[PDB]
Amino acid sequence: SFKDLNLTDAQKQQIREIMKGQRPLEERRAMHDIIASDTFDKVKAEAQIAKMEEQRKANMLALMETQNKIYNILTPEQKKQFNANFEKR
Amino acid sequence: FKDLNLTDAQKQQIREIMKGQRDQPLEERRAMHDIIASDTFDKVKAEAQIAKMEEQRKANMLALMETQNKIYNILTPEQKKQFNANFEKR
Ligand SMILES: [Cl-]
Ligand SMILES: [Cl-]
Ligand SMILES: [Zn+2]
Ligand SMILES: [Zn+2]
Ligand SMILES: [Zn+2]
Ligand SMILES: [Zn+2]
Ligand SMILES: [Zn+2]
Ligand SMILES: [Zn+2]
Ligand SMILES: [Zn+2]
Ligand SMILES: [Zn+2]
Ligand SMILES: [Zn+2]
Ligand SMILES: [Zn+2]
Ligand SMILES: [Zn+2]
Ligand SMILES: [Zn+2]
């Protein structure tokens, strides 16, 4: 139901406004090099984990802004279903 | 069990490894709920929730990769190859 909230036509348009507002392979190659090795190089692993911190930040920002904007187009009835869904995931 | 012709005892060692680094309750994503379910979006608080989440992401990626590296190193040369091939497709 994470998307089943009885959206009105206006809300469906609004979500599309919104996602126009907010619209990892070299990384997995680097994880592979750390996994496929006869030892575990913790220092190298930490540097790999960190390397795309900024792209991850911008990505999570966009998604949280998106979800907050969608939340705010919802009626009270719909907000409670969204929140109850949030609690169970 | 991914068609690697894992032997029976490779199957068991893998279980000891999985539960071994399982000796790691994670965080409180209640914070993130409160950012999303707010009249206004607070970018600075959202950035702080993200940076806090980086710390648990680091801990869980370190665990996952170390666990996978241990598994890799109980494999034969030919199994390593099919493990590497299978890694490419996921
Ligand atoms: Cl890869
Ligand atoms: Cl929550
Ligand atoms: Zn209609
Ligand atoms: Zn590329
Ligand atoms: Zn690879
Ligand atoms: Zn590589
Ligand atoms: Zn070596
Ligand atoms: Zn460290
Ligand atoms: Zn950093
Ligand atoms: Zn930054
Ligand atoms: Zn914005
Ligand atoms: Zn809260
Ligand atoms: Zn603030
Ligand atoms: Zn260790």
Residue numbers in the entry:
A (entry chain A): 28 to 50, 57 to 122
B (entry chain B): 29 to 52, 57 to 122
Provide the publication's sentences verbatim:
Spy is one of a group of chaperones that allow clients to fold while remaining continuously bound to the surface of the chaperone. We have previously observed that the chaperone substrate Im7 exists in a heterogeneous, largely disordered crystallographic ensemble while bound to the chaperone Spy. To refine strategies for detecting anomalous scattering for observing partially occupied disordered states, we co-crystallized the tight-binding Spy H96L variant with short peptides derived from its client, Im7. These peptides each had a single iodophenylalanine substitution at position 18, 19 or 20.
However, other indicators strongly suggest that this ANODE anomalous peak also arises from iodine. (i) The height of the ANODE anomalous peak is the second largest observed in this study and, at 26.4σ in the phased anomalous difference Fourier map, is substantially larger than the signals observed from zinc, chlorine and methionine sulfur, the largest of which is 9.3σ. (ii) The position of this anomalous signal is structurally inconsistent with expected zinc- or chlorine-binding residues, which would be required to enable binding with a suffciently high occupancy to produce a strong anomalous signal. Thus, although the 4.5 keV data set was not analyzed for this crystal, the strength of the signal and its chemical environment are inconsistent with it being derived from zinc or chloride, making it likely that the anomalous signal is owing to the iodine in the Im7 peptide. The larger peak heights for L18pI-Phe and K20pI-Phe, compared with each of the L19pI-Phe peaks, suggest a higher level of occupancy at these positions. Attempts to perform traditional model building using the residual L18pI-Phe and K20pI-Phe peptide density were unsuccessful owing to the weak nature of the electron density, as well as its somewhat amorphous shape, which is likely to be owing to multiple conformations within the peptide. Of note, the electron density for the L18pI-Phe and K20pI-Phe mutants has a substantially more defined shape and signal strength than that observed previously in other mutants. In the case of L18pI-Phe, the molecular-dynamics simulation used to generate the conformational pool was found to not sample positions encompassing the iodine position in the crystal, preventing any fitting and further analysis of this signal.
